[PDB]
Amino acid sequence: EHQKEIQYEILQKTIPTFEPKESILKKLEDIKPEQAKKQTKLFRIFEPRQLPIYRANGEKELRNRWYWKLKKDTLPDGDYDVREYFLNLYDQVLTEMPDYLLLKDMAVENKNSRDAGKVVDSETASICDAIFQDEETEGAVRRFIAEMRQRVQADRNVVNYPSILHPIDYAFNEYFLQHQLVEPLNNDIIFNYIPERIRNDVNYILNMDRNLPSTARYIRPNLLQDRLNLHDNFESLWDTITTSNYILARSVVPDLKELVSTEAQIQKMSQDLQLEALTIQSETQFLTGINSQAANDCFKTLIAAMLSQRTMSLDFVTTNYMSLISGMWLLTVVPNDMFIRESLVACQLAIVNTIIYPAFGMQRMHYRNGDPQTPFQIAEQQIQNFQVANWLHFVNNNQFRQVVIDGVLNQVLNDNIRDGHVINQLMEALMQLSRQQFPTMPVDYKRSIQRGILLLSNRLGQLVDLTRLLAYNYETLMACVTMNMQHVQTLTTEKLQLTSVTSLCMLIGNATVIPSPQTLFHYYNVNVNFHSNYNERINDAVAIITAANRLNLYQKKMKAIVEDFLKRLHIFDVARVPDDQMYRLRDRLRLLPVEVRRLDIFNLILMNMDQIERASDKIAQGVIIAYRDMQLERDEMYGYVNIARNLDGFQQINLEELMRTGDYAQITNMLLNNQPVALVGALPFVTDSSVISLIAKLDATVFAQIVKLRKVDTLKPILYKINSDSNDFYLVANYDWVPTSTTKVYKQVPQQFDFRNSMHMLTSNLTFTVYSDLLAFVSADTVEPINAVAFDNMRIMNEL
């Protein structure tokens, strides 16, 4: 069996299925997606600092106008690095995505002014107290700051607090308010988050106990469907889901009760069985035991299989005919549809041959099959005994009537009312058996065989009960599954020893068990979260990728995002994800919309992107060379400097392009025959006060460098912050003269500060109370098991 291993494993490496069984359950009950998401700070990007200003040719004018500047200005060097940088912001934005907000939780005293004026947040506060005193601020300012009082309306829950942010800041925080993604909450909604089914399942009691303030608030679960059809290619992963979903199931499936003492039955069994009667291959039909277990296993196992949309095989044992009979039970119910074609192969033929056909005297030509279309079937067309004949069509059908759309989008391949609790199928499965008692071969044969059959029949009164049981259970549990479920041929099986099967069968009494209330919920809850995570990450995923494209980040895109994605999903251990899989996964992802939320924000970042970049203190966009004595310009803030707010009149050379693609010296020639040229993108930076410098023409130096070897990182350019002061070098204005800068740069001037326009009002709701988990508010009991009912309404489990 060693040879079988190595290969049976080479396959398991193509399956992101975690190793141990159990190890998987935990991963689920553990996923705790739901999270109140609140926030404190208003959140900005820039506060306004004072700064020295020197009038044209002037000294520190003594005044210090207020300009906007970036808190945390960490910008890389190179257009490309810039684009990546912003991207991180997107990720930061999402991880901080405040689901809701309130202002009282940020209230602050506007120290100054009559009317107990209260303002938005700390920064808002500071600023006021600050300006209040910069004596050169229009009388209107103090006034406004003054009298402007908050806005408090008890009724309706309104709060409009005066605030001050910034155009790009209001921008953010705003939408955060207009997308509080928090819908109300009425007893009725809790009632409704319940499967349209359960409520109507008499056996279960419903009741309300706690009330609900008009303060009630929850966050949409978000249960979009599949979005991703993994059902048609990512086998490796389905297998891993099925498995998972499966274990999950077993964890739920109620344990059985009141069984017939193991010993008692097996003993009347030997009396009936006539075991040791010549036949050589003894004690293979009694390895049946451990039934007090086998049945429990066989039972659970069967359900999950179904629910989880898994597929399996059968630790089959040819000799042990009994074990076969019961098989017939299995097909009588479980829709063969979900049973790898093969295990059904063995099973049937084993029945067909070592049974029916000869003991029934029909085809004494036992049966010769190569590979038609359903050997179990065809047997029909040529069987002369109606009873036998109906079994056949019904069994070869009962195709698991794969068609359902309930309680709003829940394709849960259903099953025959018939089976359900019309049961008869069973009654007919029996009646057909009731006339299989006849000739062909040795005596110890019919004797032994038929006797076993009878044990199915008598018990049949009860076997019925089984049908009802499952009928309900599956039909119940199912209700609470959000994940859709297309029938697929899993890559992996699940062994089901006819041993246990057989036990369950003749071994169940007037027992009656069902899903504990609490149990059910717990189930819903899980799938829920999971879903939420899947859907959510999906959005998180998409959002990035798409951004990744317009943000010309022609690099990571492939794996990078995918890896993180799967990890957060928990369920599987990447690595063993075949490469055609991860990439194919992207291929599908890239073709979807984007949760307005996600999308809506990126659109915002891009519009202000430009503005930020030039807004920084370190780094400007490209430089110009003209080898033409040029007239240095003058700006109030930098004093006497060489800045250019506009390119136009000189070629543009995308540094990014050059660097990334190697150089052809186009630039090398232009520089050499010394021609007017420009360089674009983000770049290092250098300030200098050496009046002298300018005379030395330093700015025309730095350049030669590049040439050497490609690169161009080491391209610090130069600016001359020549203020009529901090420059020991001032033997300049003492001599008639004018600045001869051979070069200048693009860093556009920072923005002046205008109060008015930065002062925005604030629309915030007032006083919530966020609730998670939900359900809990549900009070629910249960009738006593001995009183159940299915669609039937007569009574599930009714063989007193």
Binding site: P167, Y170, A171, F172, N173, E174, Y175, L177, Q178, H179, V596, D600, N603, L604, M607, N646
Partner: protein
């Protein structure tokens, strides 16, 4: 040329879908397109007229953009917008008229005016949109 077209459907679908009240998410796809324009324009100078009794009005660009926040639109939002539209309207009118009079034996199928010739430029193509007229 096609450029030109957009400029309008932009304004129409604008002076039309931007009213006191409407929900933002009806214009999200729109708003964007709009801004995109302002950008491409700002930093450009134009001139129309000069022929017969047609005035020679000059134009410059330098505009702020539009918020993206707000579930619904408040009156104030509109007026600050309408003020910007009216400059473009009064603009286009003058642009159309200026290219609606000149004729050329040679390429009477190509752009004429200093105003439009400049538009067919590549750097402006980033504005095209919804050609269903």
């Amino acid at each position: 040329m096609d450029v030109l077209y957009s400029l309008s459907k932009t304004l129409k679908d604008a002076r039309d879908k931007i009213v006191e009240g409407t929900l933002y998410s009806n214009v999200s796809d729109l708003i964007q397109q709009f801004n995109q324009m302002i950008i491409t324009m700002n930093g450009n100078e134009f001139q129309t007229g000069g022929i017969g009794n047609l005035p020679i009005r000059n134009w410059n660009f330098d505009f702020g953009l539009l918020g993206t926040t707000l579930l619904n639109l408040d009156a104030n939002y509109v007026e600050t917008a309408r003020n910007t539209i009216d400059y473009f309207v009064d603009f286009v009118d003058n642009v159309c008229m200026d290219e609606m009079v000149r004729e050329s034996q040679r390429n009477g199928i190509a752009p004429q005016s200093d105003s439009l010739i400049k538009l067919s430029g590549i750097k402006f193509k980033r504005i095209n949109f919804d050609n269903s007229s």
